[PDB]
Amino acid sequence: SPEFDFTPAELRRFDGVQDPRILMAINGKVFDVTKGRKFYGPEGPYGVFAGRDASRGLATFCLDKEALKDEYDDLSDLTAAQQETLSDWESQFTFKYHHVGKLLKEGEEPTV
Amino acid sequence: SPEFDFTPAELRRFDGVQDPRILMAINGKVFDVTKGRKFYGPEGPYGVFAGRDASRGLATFCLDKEALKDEYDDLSDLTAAQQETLSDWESQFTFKYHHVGKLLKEGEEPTV
Ligand code: HEM
Ligand code: HEM
């Protein structure tokens, strides 16, 4: 929590459609990617990640919507390589976008 | 069959490892992608497609290995958009690589 922590269910409405803001989680961190609407908007190539935990899709290079989990995604089955890929993506989003807070894991308590 | 048609089981060994040749199917067409070993070899980024029907992975933009089907993949559940993507990929492989023959669908008889 630099600002506010979210559960996955709480993140869903921030998809650029139900709310003009687009939030997206990568490796436990929620980013404000509203300025990247060309990517994450409803007509964007990566719109499947809007309001979602994008970790598994980014880590495995998979845009298939049916591959996204609805609630909590335990990433413990990712390979070493997929985990390294996920970390690379996290670094890029950290550089480019505002970090809003944590995506809470199941049972994890909020901060601030 | 410009040369030879394959079932998915017959295609498997052409992965650059069990055989130096790498064959790959896209939208029912088998291509010789041996010259693209930098992509499809065992250390390549797209090695998951070597000796496989790559149609679903290319169409849905998904490199996740567990998403590949082992035998015949009925593509009838792809979306209109995924089908258009698959066609785009087919055009590119047609331009770049040698077309060997058909990937036989289940029950489909060989030609020549
Ligand atoms: C042939 C396949 C792909 C190609 C050639 C490609 C190419 C690109 C290019 C050129 C950019 C930069 C866009 C720009 O700055 O205008 C980009 C950004 C990006 N790509 Fe792709 N991509 C592909 C597939 C994928 C897949 C499968 C994923 C995720 C599962 C993905 C996720 C992303 C993300 C998250 C960005 C960052 C956009 C941002 O700056 O926030 N891409 N890609
Ligand atoms: C951020 C994600 C991605 C980026 C930036 C990206 C970028 C690229 C680039 C730059 C090339 C040309 C390589 C060269 O000519 O040296 C390429 C080729 C290719 N990409 Fe990706 N890619 C991404 C993800 C994917 C995914 C998810 C798939 C498939 C599911 C994919 C499939 C392919 C294929 C089949 C080629 C053709 C190689 C050939 O010429 O046979 N890519 N990509």
Distance, CA of A28 to CA of A80 (rounded, Å): 17
Question: How many helices and strands in chain B, by DSSP H and E?
Answer: 4, 3
Rounded to 5 degrees, φ, ψ at B66 are: -65, -10
* Residue B23: its H or E element: strand B23-26
Q: Is B64 in the pocket of ligand 1 (CB under 6 A)?
A: no
Extract the tokens encoding A29. 């961190």
Say how many domains are in chain B. Answer: 1
- Please tell me the distance between residue B66's alpha carbon and the centre of ligand 1 in angstroms: 22
Q: Which residues contact A89 (CB under 8 A, 6 or more apart)?
A: A26, A27, A58, A59
Q: Is the dihedral of CA A76, A78, A84, A86 positive or negative?
A: negative
Handedness of CA A58, A60, A64, A66 (dihedral sign): negative
Count other C-beta atoms under 10 Å from residue A21's C-beta. 16
Task: State the alpha helices, DSSP H only, in chain B.
Answer: 8-11, 37-40, 55-60, 80-96
Interface contact flag, A67 B62, Cβ < 8 Å = yes
Output phi, psi for A40, to 5 deg: -110, -5
Are A15 and A76 in contact by the 8 Å Cβ rule? The answer is no
Q: Which domain holds residue A112?
A: 1-112
Q: In terms of Cα–Cα distance, which of A59, A68, A67 is closest to A15? A: A68
Pairing of strands B29-32, A23-26: unpaired
Tell me, what CATH number does A19's domain have?
3.10.120.10
Q: Which ligand is nearest to the CA of A60?
A: 1
